[PDB]
Amino acid sequence: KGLTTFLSTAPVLITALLVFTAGLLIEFNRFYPDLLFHP
Amino acid sequence: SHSVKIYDTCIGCTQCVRACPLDVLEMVPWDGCKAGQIASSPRTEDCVGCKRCETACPTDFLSIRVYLGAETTRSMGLAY
Amino acid sequence: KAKVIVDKDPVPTSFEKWGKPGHFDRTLARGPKTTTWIWNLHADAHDFDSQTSDLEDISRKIFSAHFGHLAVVFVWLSGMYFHGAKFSNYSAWLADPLNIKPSAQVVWPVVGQDILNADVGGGFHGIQITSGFFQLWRASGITNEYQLYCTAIGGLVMAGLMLFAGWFHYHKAAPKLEWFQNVESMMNHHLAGLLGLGSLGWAGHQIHVSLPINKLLDAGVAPNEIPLPHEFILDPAKMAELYPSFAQGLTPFFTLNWGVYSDFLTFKGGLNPVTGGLWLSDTAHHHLAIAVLFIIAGHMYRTNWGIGHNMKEILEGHKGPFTGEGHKGLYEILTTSWHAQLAINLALLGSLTIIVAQHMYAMPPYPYLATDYGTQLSIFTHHMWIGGFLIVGAGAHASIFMVRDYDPAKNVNNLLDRVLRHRDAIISHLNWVCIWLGFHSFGLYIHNDTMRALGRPQDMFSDSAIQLQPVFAQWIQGLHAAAAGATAPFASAGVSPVFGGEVVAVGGKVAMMPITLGTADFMVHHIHAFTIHVTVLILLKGVLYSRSSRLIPDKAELGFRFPCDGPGRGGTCQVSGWDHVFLGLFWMYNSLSIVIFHFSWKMQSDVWGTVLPDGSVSHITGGNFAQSAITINGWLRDFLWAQAANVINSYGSALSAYGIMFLAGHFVFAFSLMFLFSGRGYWQELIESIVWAHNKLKLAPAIQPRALSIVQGRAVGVAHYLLGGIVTTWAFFLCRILSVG
Amino acid sequence: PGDFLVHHAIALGLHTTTLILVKGALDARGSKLMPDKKDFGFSFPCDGPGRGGTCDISAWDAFYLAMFWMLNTLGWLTFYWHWKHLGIWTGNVAQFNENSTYLMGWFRDYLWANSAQLINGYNPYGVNNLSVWAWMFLFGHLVWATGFMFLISWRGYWQELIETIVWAHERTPLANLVRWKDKPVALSIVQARLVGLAHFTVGYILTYAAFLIASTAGKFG
Amino acid sequence: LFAGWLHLQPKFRPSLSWFKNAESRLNHHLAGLFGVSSLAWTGHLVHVAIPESRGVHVGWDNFLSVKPHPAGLA
Amino acid sequence: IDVVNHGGDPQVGNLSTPINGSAFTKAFINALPAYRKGLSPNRRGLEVGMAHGYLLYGPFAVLGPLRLTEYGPTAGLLATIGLVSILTICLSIYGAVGVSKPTETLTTPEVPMDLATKEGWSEFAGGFLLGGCGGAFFAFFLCQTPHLQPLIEVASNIWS
Amino acid sequence: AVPTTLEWNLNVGLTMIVCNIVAIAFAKYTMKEPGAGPKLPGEAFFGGMGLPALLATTSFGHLLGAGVILGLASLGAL
Numbered sequence A: 001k002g003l004t005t006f007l008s009t010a011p012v013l014i015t016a017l018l019v020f021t022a023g024l025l026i027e028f029n030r031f032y033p034d035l036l037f038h039p
Numbered sequence B: 001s002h003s004v005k006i007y008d009t010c011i012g013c014t015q016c017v018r019a020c021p022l023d024v025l026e027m028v029p030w031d032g033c034k035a036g037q038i039a040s041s042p043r044t045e046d047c048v049g050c051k052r053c054e055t056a057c058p059t060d061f062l063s064i065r066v067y068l069g070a071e072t073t074r075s076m077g078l079a080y
Numbered sequence C: 001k002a003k004v005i006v007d008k009d010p011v012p013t014s015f016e017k018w019g020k021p022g023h024f025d026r027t028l029a030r031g032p033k034t035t036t037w038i039w040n041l042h043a044d045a046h047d048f049d050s051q052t053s054d055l056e057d058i059s060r061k062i063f064s065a066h067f068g069h070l071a072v073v074f075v076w077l078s079g080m081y082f083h084g085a086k087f088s089n090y091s092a093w094l095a096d097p098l099n100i101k102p103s104a105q106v107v108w109p110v111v112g113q114d115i116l117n118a119d120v121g122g123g124f125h126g127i128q129i130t131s132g133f134f135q136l137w138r139a140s141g142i143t144n145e146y147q148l149y150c151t152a153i154g155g156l157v158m159a160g161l162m163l164f165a166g167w168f169h170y171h172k173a174a175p176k177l178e179w180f181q182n183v184e185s186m187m188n189h190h191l192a193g194l195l196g197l198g199s200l201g202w203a204g205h206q207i208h209v210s211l212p213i214n215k216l217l218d219a220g221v222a223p224n225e226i227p228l229p230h231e232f233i234l235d236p237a238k239m240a241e242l243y244p245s246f247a248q249g250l251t252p253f254f255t256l257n258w259g260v261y262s263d264f265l266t267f268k269g270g271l272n273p274v275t276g277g278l279w280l281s282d283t284a285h286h287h288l289a290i291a292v293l294f295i296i297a298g299h300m301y302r303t304n305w306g307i308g309h310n311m312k313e314i315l316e317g318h319k320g321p322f323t324g325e326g327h328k329g330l331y332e333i334l335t336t337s338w339h340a341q342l343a344i345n346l347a348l349l350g351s352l353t354i355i356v357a358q359h360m361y362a363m364p365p366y367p368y369l370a371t372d373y374g375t376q377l378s379i380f381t382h383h384m385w386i387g388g389f390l391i392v393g394a395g396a397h398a399s400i401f402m403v404r405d406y407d408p409a410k411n412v413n414n415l416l417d418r419v420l421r422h423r424d425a426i427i428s429h430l431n432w433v434c435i436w437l438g439f440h441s442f443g444l445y446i447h448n449d450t451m452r453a454l455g456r457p458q459d460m461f462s463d464s465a466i467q468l469q470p471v472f473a474q475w476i477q478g479l480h481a482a483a484a485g486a487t488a489p490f491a492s493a494g495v496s497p498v499f500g501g502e503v504v505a506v507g508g509k510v511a512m513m514p515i516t517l518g519t520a521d522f523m524v525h526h527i528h529a530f531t532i533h534v535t536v537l538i539l540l541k542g543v544l545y546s547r548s549s550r551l552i553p554d555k556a557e558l559g560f561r562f563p564c565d566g567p568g569r570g571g572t573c574q575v576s577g578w579d580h581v582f583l584g585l586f587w588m589y590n591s592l593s594i595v596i597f598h599f600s601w602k603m604q605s606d607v608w609g610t611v612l613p614d615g616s617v618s619h620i621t622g623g624n625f626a627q628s629a630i631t632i633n634g635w636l637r638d639f640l641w642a643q644a645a646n647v648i649n650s651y652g653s654a655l656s657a658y659g660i661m662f663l664a665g666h667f668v669f670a671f672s673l674m675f676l677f678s679g680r681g682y683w684q685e686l687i688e689s690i691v692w693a694h695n696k697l698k699l700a701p702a703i704q705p706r707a708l709s710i711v712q713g714r715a716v717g718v719a720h721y722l723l724g725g726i727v728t729t730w731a732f733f734l735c736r737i738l739s740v741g
Numbered sequence D: 001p002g003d004f005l006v007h008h009a010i011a012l013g014l015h016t017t018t019l020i021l022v023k024g025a026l027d028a029r030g031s032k033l034m035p036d037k038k039d040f041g042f043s044f045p046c047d048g049p050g051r052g053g054t055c056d057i058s059a060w061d062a063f064y065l066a067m068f069w070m071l072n073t074l075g076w077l078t079f080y081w082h083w084k085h086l087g088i089w090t091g092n093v094a095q096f097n098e099n100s101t102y103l104m105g106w107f108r109d110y111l112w113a114n115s116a117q118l119i120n121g122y123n124p125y126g127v128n129n130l131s132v133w134a135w136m137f138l139f140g141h142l143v144w145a146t147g148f149m150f151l152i153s154w155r156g157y158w159q160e161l162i163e164t165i166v167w168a169h170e171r172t173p174l175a176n177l178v179r180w181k182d183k184p185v186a187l188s189i190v191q192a193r194l195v196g197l198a199h200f201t202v203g204y205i206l207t208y209a210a211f212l213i214a215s216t217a218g219k220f221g
Numbered sequence E: 001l002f003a004g005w006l007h008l009q010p011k012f013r014p015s016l017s018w019f020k021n022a023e024s025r026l027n028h029h030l031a032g033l034f035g036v037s038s039l040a041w042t043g044h045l046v047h048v049a050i051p052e053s054r055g056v057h058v059g060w061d062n063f064l065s066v067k068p069h070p071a072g073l074a
Numbered sequence F: 001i002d003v004v005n006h007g008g009d010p011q012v013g014n015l016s017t018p019i020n021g022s023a024f025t026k027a028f029i030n031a032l033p034a035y036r037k038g039l040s041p042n043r044r045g046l047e048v049g050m051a052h053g054y055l056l057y058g059p060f061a062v063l064g065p066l067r068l069t070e071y072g073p074t075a076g077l078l079a080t081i082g083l084v085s086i087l088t089i090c091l092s093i094y095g096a097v098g099v100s101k102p103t104e105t106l107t108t109p110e111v112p113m114d115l116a117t118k119e120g121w122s123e124f125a126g127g128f129l130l131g132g133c134g135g136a137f138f139a140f141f142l143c144q145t146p147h148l149q150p151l152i153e154v155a156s157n158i159w160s
Numbered sequence G: 001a002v003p004t005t006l007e008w009n010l011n012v013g014l015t016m017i018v019c020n021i022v023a024i025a026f027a028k029y030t031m032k033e034p035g036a037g038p039k040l041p042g043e044a045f046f047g048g049m050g051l052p053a054l055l056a057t058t059s060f061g062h063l064l065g066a067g068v069i070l071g072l073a074s075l076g077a078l
Ligand code: CLA
Pocket: C431, C432, C434, C435, C436, C437, C438, C439, C442, C443, C446, C534, C537, C538, C583, C584, C586, C587, D142, D145, D146, D147, D148, D149, D150, D152, D153, D161
């Protein structure tokens, strides 16, 4: 019960958010690379 | 010599006098406060200007206020 | 006297304090009213003395945190062994170690960073590592990647064991205060049981594993027909066919017939001509000798049985006329203060790491270590930087000892009291020797710049010009070159080819040459002494003037880490013991940067290079240290401008990450000066302007945004300065030496 | 495309230098942390470590922190002018047109490439006519780096150092005959901000004037 | 010189009974100053002077290696 | 036995170490031209200037722009004369500002009262001028008259 | 160059015993607390030291004996 409060702290959630955002961007630039502009 | 000026927004908490390292400040009786006392700076020629009194003041803006002026051998705090 | 006594379950293991940050400090527990709370959460997270006043709880926290740090280090080591096992060309490198570069990290191809996978040989693409793990595993007798995988698994198991021990020694069975005060038992078990038994076990490994596998490797046997190290023990016939004194048993050890062990316990001294490393017989004999010496030294101190010393009567008996009372009070200082122990241990570990750096370049312990110039340059630079950081941290913790753990009642007329009593005479003469060294080490360079600029090459401080030959170091070099056979009659060669002899060369490249010292070496060694002395001056001035001065006499009540006392007395800015560490970080940057620049130029110009078939050595730069390392323009032109041609032309190649890191370190160095030059009261007013714009759109944060504090502003500035400079020098060094080496 | 990005760097430099300058001009009379900033005047050191820390709060901080931004902006635009005009005057304009879009082209094809004849103004093999410009280059580096001493290290360290030096003078024989009329103290806080600023500035102009003149005089000379 | 300076310091100044101890002074002067010194000169003679008279260089390096007689100390 | 004592007054910021004030440094500092008991100014300055002018014809004679040239000893003499003149101007303006009584330490419990006045420091400066010129010229004459004098070959082979 | 190590004559054992006795004499003259020890029969024969003191003297005699045996083997004695 006290663990979920620690996971709800600012550094843990900002790390989870940044890893999720970086993973989404990396998985996008793997499957759809080299997008300098919208065609 | 520096100018230590005490204004009328003083609660008489005596924190400036206990924070002062060169006995510049003291407490005088005062009818305009709940604590019945206000700070005064008689021997302000001994003030170095460290502003420890300004650090310890609990007013929103400080009732005790140090103005750095002419520099003497005591304002510089020189052992030589 | 020395017994095991613990408290059972002193701290319960619950997650309720995980969700309550700032629990360790009373001031941090009121809640984050301002953003200074967030930085105070990290600044005081490990300062266990400010958390609790009981030394037993502090020592328990320290003992349990050491296990977590060891678990982190073991996770790191297991990760390195796993990268050697899975993502490396170590099996390819063992077949051809003279034409295949060591690589242990592949780069994922999601963006154009697939170019960062360098072509290193054997059909493997990856980053050319310079850590020297490959040469370390070759010296350890590791022949296949499964032995690295097993070591990685063992590192994970040991890291989990250390984590469990850290939980156990804080939440299940935590030792008392007097379990820490008996440093006699601790030091006996660290000398004999940790250093002695560790070096004895490594001596046994080097006898049974490293020596036969490495002798078969140097004899020309491919590693996948080389037998595994356990049939060398299980079948002693294969172990005794080479080095044939294993035919006789262990009885010559016990009858003191040690001489027949001379085939595999040698004192050859020099480098292996086949590999360029030290003889592994010399290393095994060395580890056995220092194991016996450390085990003997671990029986010095009285623990439980009457025999031994108590480390107090040794201190009590050491007293003279110039001191009087002596070392009385120092045992209580070192057994009641953790900061004095950290200041001693961190200084000795820093100087030890610097010794490691200065020794592994001249006497390379590993096969094909001196051949790969990148590994040697990287380990030298890395260990200099680590050692200097530890020395500055020692100055820091001496300053923390002086205001937080020093007691004047226990220290009357001893050594520490008298150092405090003549600190003005200490610091003023250190200031004079710093000024003298600065003038007569840097004004020589300024004079040489001036006379080379004014067309006066005969008025300079050069070998052709007015000479400044380091006659004492040359005499010591002559003593070491003639040491084998005269003062060390049972050494086949000298300890290193540095002091004399011939060019040790492996393949086509030079392992080591003699390093002749001239006017440039004299002048740069005096700059080394100067920069070391100024770092000593700032750190020691922070130590001695930590409690009081003529400026601020009541400075111990302000603490170790405070910004200033005010604008009075002219302005008492950066008076604290912390700010002397802050300035000493800049000066260790300057010192160690000049050290690694001297190394990277002297070895490239006068040691490293290729061997022509005629016999002459063609160096990397061409021996320009003799004439260009005497001028600042020569250091700028022939070293910084000339050798950074590789790091700036690295784009579109396999070393372009080094050019990226070069520019990134330049960015972080420039970014540091915003924090270093400016002050808090600018940024507080700027944040006040931003707060109103947030208030206009209902964007007021609950935690009020404050500017970083003055000490935190200095800390951020110095951390960015060191990071940006060190990353820059790392990138420059590695991209230069991965192109010319 | 190499002119778009440098123009936005220039716009960043003017806007930020304007931000320090407007910020210190409009907060000169006072603000939330320091209401009575007009009583101490234009140029004062601080208002103590109280109220969270009050370093660089005088309206002189605007000038002091905007000299750096003005020098950085003028460095950006003069590097722009010099590299574009070197591409024009050499006749190879493609170097700027392909390498100014990224900063390593700036760092390599403009700084490293055009410092070559500069730093070879004096070498072990002789002396050129640009030896005074190489000497000014190194002189500007020395003064610019000496400014870092006044800007990073602050006053009370030096006051504590000068106290030991004063003790050493007054306690040594044969030099305690020579007594100062005025007591040697460290440079004050605003004075040392100004001295480090002047060193930064003088080193900045000296080393860029040396690099500029030698870079475009070793080619077109 | 350092011994003479040391024996003027009050910690190491000998008492009057030590100076008038004739029995110990005679014992250490006949056994040690006259006997041990003559024995040491015999050691130098049989170790250095006699072999150097016979062409055998000894020095401080070889006196633990060059045995003065073919039947040494047996 | 505390060999490092105070000077008799512990709260004064100095220590009576062996180097500072024991037996051999109280003499030979009290017996130097400065702090000697019987000398007047223009005699202290004469002795000090003679020693200084003699020693300063060592890094100008063999260390200069002309040290490979036969004009080198003469240029070193002229440079020593110029430095002695600059130092005399410094002494003269230091006296002309106004001098106080010199600092009394543990090594020198008695300082010269004659150097505590502006007139005494003018005599000291004049004696320093005459002594410096005499010492520089004497060192020039000694170095020049044998024309080789192989003691000068030592510390010029070092300072090649 | 081997140091002529002299593989186990009886003079090696005699020298080891003699230097053990030398360690006994040195420890009986110079130790501070030799009476510490749990128990041993015949304290009169062992000079009134405990068992850890006995181990310390025997170990010091082994260090001294090893040093003198290797030194006098390298010189050529024994
Ligand atoms: C290039 C940059 C630079 C320079 C010149 C200095 C200069 C100095 N530093 Mg340093 N320092 C710097 C940057 C610099 N620092 C920065 C970045 C910081 C880090 C925050 C500091 C912080 C710092 C601290 C913390 C300390 C110093 C100290 C010192 C002094 C060392 C003594 C010495 O070498 O005297 C010799 C002087 C030089 C080598 C400078 C070159 C001068 C040449 C050789 C002589 C030319 C003079 C010329 C002939 C005069 C005639 C010209 C005429 C027209 C006037 C010296 C004055 C230490 C100190 O003062 O104690 C001794 C000390 O405590 N430094």
